[PDB]
């Protein structure tokens, strides 16, 4: 009611008009008045413990490992940037697109080729995060991304 | 995010107005007067289903009383006779018997006069 555009004038006298008492028309009891306890710009972030984050990371990968949904690869045969190239590689690797896949690799050309597939989410290893792991039905990592992961939960 | 009233209050008001169909004037047209009328209505129904049990027992007793006095005794002596005879036919069935089966009620009167 202080931030609203109206004057602070008392709209009519306190007593003897036969109307209810009022002050200015910005009060929240008026149509067009200020709002009581409305939202204000707000920071929702908070510092979750680092050890909780790191342990969550390891558990999320463990969960896929225990399901058999974690697959590591040395190299992406001949995928050089084209989505069709990654699709061929995926088929031979058993990724027929019936399951969503989180693809973690530092190879840019592999990420650019897979990323437009509706069933693939692509990450560089330094961006491995548990929400993205739990989002997807399968985990597919470079041996290089795997070592970055192992360095981070250590 | 904002959560304006929307549909919620209209729907609550229609539930109440629907329960108030048949009420006089604004008691079926105004949400406020209908709600006030229903407050009373619910208490009455509660109080009156308690009361209905007494209303009917009163009717049975009155009919039983007249049936007895056609055979020369009154209700209280009749009931006492039934208690000494060990007869446990309740007042709802006794009043039915007094109307629908006068030969059986005449017998029951016999048992009662004889049980004293």
């Amino acid at each position: 009611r202080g931030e609203v555009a109206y004057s602070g004038r008392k709209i009519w006298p306190q007593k003897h008009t036969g109307r209810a008492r009022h002050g200015d028309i910005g009060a929240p009891i008026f149509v067009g008045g200020g709002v009581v306890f409305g939202p204000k710009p707000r920071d929702y972030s908070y510092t979750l413990p680092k050890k909780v984050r790191k342990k969550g990371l390891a558990m999320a990968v463990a969960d896929r490992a225990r399901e058999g949904k974690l697959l590591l690869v040395e190299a992406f045969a001949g995928v050089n940037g084209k989505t069709k190239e990654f699709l061929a590689w995926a088929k031979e690797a058993g990724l027929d697109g019936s399951e969503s896949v989180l693809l973690v690799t530092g190879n840019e050309l592999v990420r650019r080729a897979a990323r437009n597939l509706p069933w693939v989410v692509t990450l560089a290893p330094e961006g491995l995060n548990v929400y993205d792991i739990v989002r997807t039905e399968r985990l597919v990592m470079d041996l290089d991304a795997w070592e970055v992961f192992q360095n981070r939960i250590g | 995010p904002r959560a304006k009233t929307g549909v919620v209050r209209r729907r609550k008001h229609k539930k109440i107005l629907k329960l108030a169909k048949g009420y006089w004037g604004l008691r079926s047209k105004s949400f406020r007067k209908a709600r006030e009328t229903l407050f009373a209505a619910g208490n009455y129904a509660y109080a009156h289903r308690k009361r209905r049990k007494r209303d009917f027992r009163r009717l049975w007793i009155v009919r039983i009383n007249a049936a007895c006095r056609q055979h020369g005794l009154n209700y209280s002596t009749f009931i006492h006779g039934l208690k000494k005879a060990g007869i446990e036919v309740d007042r709802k069935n006794l009043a039915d018997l007094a109307v629908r089966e006068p030969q059986v009620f005449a017998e029951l009167v016999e048992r009662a006069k004889a049980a004293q």
């Binding site: - | 229903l38 407050f39 009373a40 209505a41 619910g42 208490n43 129904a45 509660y46 005879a85 060990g86 007869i87 446990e88 036919v89 309740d90 709802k92 069935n93 039915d96 018997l97 089966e101 030969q103 059986v104 017998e107 029951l108 048992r111």
Partner: protein
């Protein structure tokens, strides 16, 4: 012939062929049950003191149900006290098979 039976804490005049709702009984639908008799009437008159020793009524339980909902509503003025309860009374439905006098 008619009989006055007692079930569910209450008394009913029953004749063969009568369908009747009584308080819920623990009896499978389709089964038949025997109701105790307080009085026989019609042809002969038998008076129980209180219940007739030999007599019984055979009834086939047709099924169980829940009665039409009753709104139990409580309100106390000037005290913001309101209560709304929905009540459905269970019942067993009986077909009166015979008066075994």
């Amino acid at each position: 012939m008619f009989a006055i039976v007692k079930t569910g804490g209450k008394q009913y005049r029953v004749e063969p062929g009568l369908k009747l709702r009584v308080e819920k009984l623990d009896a499978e639908p389709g089964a038949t049950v025997e109701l105790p008799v307080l009085l026989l009437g019609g042809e002969k008159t038998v008076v129980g003191t209180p219940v007739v020793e030999g007599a019984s009524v055979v009834a086939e339980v047709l099924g169980h149900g829940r009665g039409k909902k009753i709104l139990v509503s409580k309100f106390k003025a000037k005290v913001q006290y309101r209560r709304k309860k929905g009540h459905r009374q269970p019942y067993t439905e009986l077909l009166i098979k015979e008066i075994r006098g």
